Subunit: 340 residues, 3 copies
Amino acid sequence: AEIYNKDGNKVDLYGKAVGLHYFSKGNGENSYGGNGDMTYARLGFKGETQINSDLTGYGQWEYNFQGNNSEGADAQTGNKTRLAFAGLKYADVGSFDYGRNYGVVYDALGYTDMLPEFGGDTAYSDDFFVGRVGGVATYRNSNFFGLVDGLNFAVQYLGKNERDTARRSNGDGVGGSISYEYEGFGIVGAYGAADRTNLQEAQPLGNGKKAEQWATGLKYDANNIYLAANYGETRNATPITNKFTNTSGFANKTQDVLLVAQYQFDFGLRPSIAYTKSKAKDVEGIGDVDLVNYFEVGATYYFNKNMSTYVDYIINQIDSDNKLGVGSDDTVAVGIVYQF
Amino acid sequence: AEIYNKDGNKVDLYGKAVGLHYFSKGNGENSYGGNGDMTYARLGFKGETQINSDLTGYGQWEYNFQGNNSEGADAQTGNKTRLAFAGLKYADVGSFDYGRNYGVVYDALGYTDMLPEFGGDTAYSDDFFVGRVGGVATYRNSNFFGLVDGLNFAVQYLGKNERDTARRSNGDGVGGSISYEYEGFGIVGAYGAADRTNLQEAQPLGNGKKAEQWATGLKYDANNIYLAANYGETRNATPITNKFTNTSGFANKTQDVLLVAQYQFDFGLRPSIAYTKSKAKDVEGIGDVDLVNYFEVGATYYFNKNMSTYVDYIINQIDSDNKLGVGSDDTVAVGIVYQF
Amino acid sequence: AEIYNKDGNKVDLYGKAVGLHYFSKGNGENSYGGNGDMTYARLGFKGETQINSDLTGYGQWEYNFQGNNSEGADAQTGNKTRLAFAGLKYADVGSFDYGRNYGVVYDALGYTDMLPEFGGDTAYSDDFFVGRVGGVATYRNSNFFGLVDGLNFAVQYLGKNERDTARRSNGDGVGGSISYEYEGFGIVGAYGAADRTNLQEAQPLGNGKKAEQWATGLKYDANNIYLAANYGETRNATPITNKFTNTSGFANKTQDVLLVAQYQFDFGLRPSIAYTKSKAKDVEGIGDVDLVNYFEVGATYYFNKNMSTYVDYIINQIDSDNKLGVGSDDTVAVGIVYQF
């Protein structure tokens, strides 16, 4: 909600309280999304100041407060800053920002990250260019310097992040995306490569000294209809764990597919149908193994722009004999959202 | 403070900075409330949107930031989300919400949870239905579908919460309350029973496979006067610890009494007089033991709706030979509150 | 930004998103400020209510959210509440507040704590009276009860804080400051002494049962010019660590000097030139050792009151043979700030 706007500076303080519950059989240990209370809230701010007619400065911060912990020792479990960056946009020259933000490959994966509760399985956090990462400098251009309507691109520099964990670490890298949007249609191409850290290389699964990720996307977004598809691959970038051996590392290779079809009725109901499959190739020891594989059926009902509720149902196609231990059970999520 | 209100959506961003200090002799280890700096702040939001004339959606989140930690490793000690839920209210049919919220038995204990700094001793957190808990779905009805002014009720479904700790855990359960309010008077009855988790049962103190809590309350609230009384009992629900043995578990049984009398002068001064006593019965090993037992004398002075200060004084009646190790010393709390 | 103001109560919700990066050679282990992403954000509130013409109540809370952690286990690293206090100001009688706030000696050190990114090296946190500490009651008087324009003073009572760490602990103490400001000029004197805790005394470095800190400051602040200088000393108060032995404690004695000269051009550019040197004396084992020693050259460019960027460059004068292991490499900080 825009709580402030004076002297060319406008601040939008936003947030949401999400009452959420997952239903899966057993201890949800073998299910797709788990089981139980998953309630949470978000708080963030987006600021934008007009320094003059061509120049705009802006900043954004977003935080995640879990609502399913006790007030005891586990109280902070899952809390984290999702985004934190500042930047400038100049006339038709482009924008530049730095901080914790979305990797450029997400410029593609965003196409199908539209499910009510699940979806966007390949857009992992602190995983190079596919989701939110820290220390990325991003330049973005719209309408090719204003010369070509609908043609945009971006280049992104990722700085080394040597964390205590191989999963949350990364070396230096560069990535970019090019997308084009013409009347309801949009097509995107995104790619990034980076160095892997010592610790990443010391891992049992995955082999290489460079991580890569690329994805392409296609969409039709107009007339209440939303159809989107993504296809991408990765080398030594996707994190995996052998639940049996309790081993961990990255998938030498993956081929990922995501499709989504939804429709927005005028009365508020937005049904969703999706399909996702991510398969790893050459996993040291297992060979080829599916990591994600399911159908989704779900629906969101918007009471208005501040209130909604939904049910997301995952029909897991993973099979009980999956070599890595990936769960095969279904999961149903029900949620009630208030937001501003 | 209502910082936003447009298009049927109003957001109230609220909070407070509480400069607080406890005075108890010794290292406050044997006193009622401890000793030293207890400064803290709160931040939360309450949103409410009119979806149409009969339907209202709403949400709320509240957080606790301790102000008495260092900027070092202990910086997060005591921080936590207190409430996080979303819901809908429909005409005279009732309201329904889900998330981290207050158990239904608190519909009763709330009567006497009015002391300046202390009080409300039996309304523990993550303790079934008496205080704030996670994963509770609550239905509330006001004025019996609009047919009976002053007659309200509520039913609440608590979902299993298997935490790493027996104290912060719970199995499934149901609870409800019925209350009636007629011209300054109010009477309430509340009750809930739930399953105890494996871990709760593996504890040294307390024996059973079901937890129960009920409380009744009576109050006279009008003419600057506030008198209230609560009486309730519990089975295997109240957490206790033998400081000697360093043993822990739940009280097989407890009988709790709370009384409160206060008066609000027109100039801002609100004196308080209270009495609290919670005694455990059949504690495995000790027999009957008091857990809480004191008189309170205190006062709050309101400068206005945003500023106040108070002194709360606990005259501990617990005795030095208390079998569980419960402290017997007095405690005086002084505080200065700014809030919005 | 003042988001609320009605009925004599005004709330200012403020914050900033700082995209920040440090450049130092090596693993920045031997450099002055480290190396890598240092992005962060701040959120806080300052409230003030007019209780009547002479009386004002107020409160403030400020938090620090690190933007350079992963969304993993390290997500909370560096997060903390910086300030949390409430108070009252009465006519010309003075103000009084309690909570986590700045020690009185900072009334002096504040003079030179003006560098774009670094500086203020001696104003440590949870270090008695020099920076932010918890549990301090502060009385401040302006214009000597309104009888002497420009003459102010303050006295501060620090309550014992026995933390798990010798570095973040303190015993009781008192401190005060007196300052005078006449037309661009300002002079200050500040001093405080406190008890050291058992744990502080059990430390390998430093010897005494009382901690002291005093600093004097002088400044010329007017005509776009800002020149300031501080000189102060301390006994058993400054924390130090022998990187070789991995020993820790406090410096028996230190003599600290800080100078700063800056100029604010009308177009937005504010160049900075500074010099800092803190040397410890009688360190048990080493003798005399520099703790801080460098020149700073830097500049901030203000696009407007909400947006700025800067480069701060530290020309470290510490030498590679420094007995404590203090780093000798240079550090360059670049940052982009959005704030409201």
